[PDB]
Design a protein around this ligand. Structure first.
Ligand code: HEM
Ligand code: HEM
Ligand SMILES: [Cl-]
Ligand SMILES: [Cl-]
Ligand SMILES: [Cl-]
Ligand SMILES: [Cl-]
Ligand SMILES: [Cl-]
Ligand SMILES: [Cl-]
Ligand SMILES: [Cl-]
Ligand SMILES: [Cl-]
Ligand SMILES: [Cl-]
Ligand code: NA
Ligand code: NA
Ligand code: NA
Ligand code: NA
Ligand code: NA
Ligand code: NA
Ligand code: NA
Ligand code: NA
Lengths: 355, 352
């Protein structure tokens, strides 16, 4: 194989329109330090380390933890984002960043379907670590988090997986359906600018950036597995094996809305007329300690340049009447502003944090 | 089809099979009360495992027989290994299905742990080079067992070997596996792993599986000196060589390593096992707010009383590794010998 490296420095952060890797570690952190200088050091230390990750005194602790020494970089990417709590917490503006706060960075509105665990969402800082090998992804996250002890406390850490098809087929979620068809092509720069990338109207540090929505969505695999193929397909409006819209021959044929249930998932999301870039991963977390049922679902991640215009209307349309709600439950939620890309020589979020 | 491991044979796959990258490890309790339900369970598991591992119409108004998420994936060297805990033969004094007369001779819970994190009547170890493939296999196996078993726990894990065939590294960053004999050396695996005498005949060609869920304190480990890390094991970190030797594969000179090092204590027992462990991570430790991670320690041995319990004894008292680890769960399972095509897993035990 060729080198499995994704460029870290550029106009954009990697991990967004980068091709979807197989594994993710997703962590949220809260800043406990009270001085912006500590955060500056964090982000320049994170930048140098991430550049190393993505590319003699025995009485001292090893600088690196060592468990990816013999492994390929496996298309490792690290994406950083800022939560609303980074800018304002407990009624006070932090670190003097009011002038630089993004337009659309607020917590997502409360939906009635939600069973949100506050500790499973939010966070001042998110770190999305993706690679085609789970040990590589964990190694990257662990070394990054090792730098933040002293400055931050980790809020939560999730991990997930999503295997694309052997022949390049659209990857399937835990319900067995191709997941990602409705995305536009990430190699179409024009469409990514219109959907994902902030181009103007925001602070300089957010230009070339995007907003990341995070929803941890439990999936009721047991009752889904007892449901008929027809019910499963009716839930989505696509046929399970082909991923083709109802009444169509191929996965990539256009959805015909008059042929699918109006409460189906695809119909409702298509109804808004809005677009986002989904980049989710499945998770399994053993058995629910309470119910003794399998804990599994979707780490739903999507990017959009304007979440108020593109993402909240989807939540509203789905939270109302989505057939998928029978089989899912949102238990975690967060929104993060992902900075524009980093130039070599500079550090992540330098335009935001620097005086 | 290249990434296919044979399911039928003299032995169960997943033991001397080359170590795959991902594991799901489940324990089930039998809730059915009639032995005929257990036989159909194992017959159906045998057919389904044969389908799942080999790669390989129905009406849309019925539930799909398969859950679908591995449809476009390679078999990925999927193996599925079955074992029985002591409770499968007697629980609370009762002989449950007339099987106690066929109980294995060394199947007693390991002497002193979270009990919800060990035990069980049945274990299933599912290994594949792709995590989605392994979950799909376990999920469909567990779906077949509803009504007859309840799932006790599910752990999962990972262990990536080097691209250059290098020995895989655990989460402390040390090569892990060097002390194992070659799993391709049939005579050595016969001597260490495979049962051919001293057990009921369904155990012939089988083995005992030891499972230990061992928490690894990564935060304090990563803050410990490289010399302290090496002194813990008695091998150098990058090369994996025993102290005083050049190569990973050089013999261990016990005079050159601390008497309380992990390698010294285990080797000086004179005993040997076949270790086939996987790393794990499971979110944050709430008591400390640091990463909850560890080793899913899995070993195979023909006689745990002779080969494994001596190691547990020597390490539990004096191992320097105990400073950085804590055992959270423990179980011992008896794995049946292999299944011949036409038969079913544990037929010789269940048919009587
Ligand atoms: C466990 C939760 C979810 C599952 C299993 C799921 C699965 C799917 C599937 C199978 C499709 C059809 C194939 C595709 O185009 O990818 C789809 C489409 C889509 N879903 Fe989801 N989804 C989930 C949650 C969400 C949420 C929370 C949102 C938005 C708030 C969302 C937005 C969309 C969009 C925008 C599409 C493409 C619609 C189009 O064709 O234009 N999904 N999803
Ligand atoms: C988190 C827990 C553990 C870790 C991190 C760990 C790691 C290691 C490492 C790095 C080595 C040296 C390289 C090798 O030969 O593989 C080793 C050797 C070994 N370990 Fe462990 N191990 C753990 C638990 C255990 C347990 C619980 C046992 C037995 C009850 C055990 C038995 C052995 C044996 C038999 C050897 C080979 C000794 C020889 O050279 O003859 N290990 N282990
Ligand atoms: Cl670069
Ligand atoms: Cl967590
Ligand atoms: Cl691209
Ligand atoms: Cl814009
Ligand atoms: Cl977990
Ligand atoms: Cl799991
Ligand atoms: Cl705007
Ligand atoms: Cl800890
Ligand atoms: Cl040796
Ligand atoms: Na369409
Ligand atoms: Na008993
Ligand atoms: Na569990
Ligand atoms: Na090395
Ligand atoms: Na984890
Ligand atoms: Na231990
Ligand atoms: Na046999
Ligand atoms: Na055979």
């Amino acid at each position: 194989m060729e080198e499995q490296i994704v460029p870290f420095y550029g106009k954009h952060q990697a991990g967004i329109t980068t091709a979807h890797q197989t594994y993710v570690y997703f962590a949220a952190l809260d800043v406990t330090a009270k001085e912006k200088s500590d955060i500056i050091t964090l982000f320049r230390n994170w930048t140098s380390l991430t550049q190393m990750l993505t590319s003699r005194n025995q009485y001292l602790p090893p600088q690196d933890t060592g468990e990816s020494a013999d492994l390929s970089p496996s298309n490792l990417t690290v994406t950083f984002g800022f939560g609303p709590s980074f800018f304002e917490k407990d009624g006070k503006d932090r670190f003097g960043l009011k002038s630089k706060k993004p337009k659309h960075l607020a917590a997502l509105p409360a939906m009635p379907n939600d069973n949100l665990d506050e500790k499973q969402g939010g966070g001042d800082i998110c770190i999305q670590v993706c690679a085609d090998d789970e040990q590589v992804a964990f190694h990257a996250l662990r070394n990054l988090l090792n730098q933040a002890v002293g400055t931050c406390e980790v809020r939560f850490v999730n991990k997930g997986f999503l295997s694309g098809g052997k022949n390049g087929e659209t990857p399937r979620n835990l319900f067995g359906f191709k997941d990602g068809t409705g995305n536009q092509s990430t190699e179409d720069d024009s469409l990514m600018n219109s959907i994902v990338w902030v181009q103007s109207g925001e602070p300089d540090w957010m230009t070339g950036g995007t907003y990341m929505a995070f929803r941890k969505i439990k999936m009721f695999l047991e009752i889904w597995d007892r449901s008929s193929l027809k019910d499963q397909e009716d839930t989505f409006g696509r046929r399970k094996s082909s991923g083709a819209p109802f009444g169509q021959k191929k996965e990539t044929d256009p959805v015909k809305l008059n042929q699918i249930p109006s409460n189906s998932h695809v119909s409702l999301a298509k109804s808004t007329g809005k677009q986002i870039l989904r980049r989710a991963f499945s998770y399994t977390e053993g058995l629910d300690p309470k119910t003794g049922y399998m804990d599994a679902g979707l780490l739903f991640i999507s990017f959009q340049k304007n979440p108020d215009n593109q993402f909240i209307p989807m939540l509203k349309a789905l939270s109302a009447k989505d057939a998928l709600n029978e089989y899912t439950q949102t238990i975690g939620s967060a929104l993060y502003a992902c900075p524009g890309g980093c130039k070599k020589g500079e550090y992540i979020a330098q335009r935001l944090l620097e005086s």
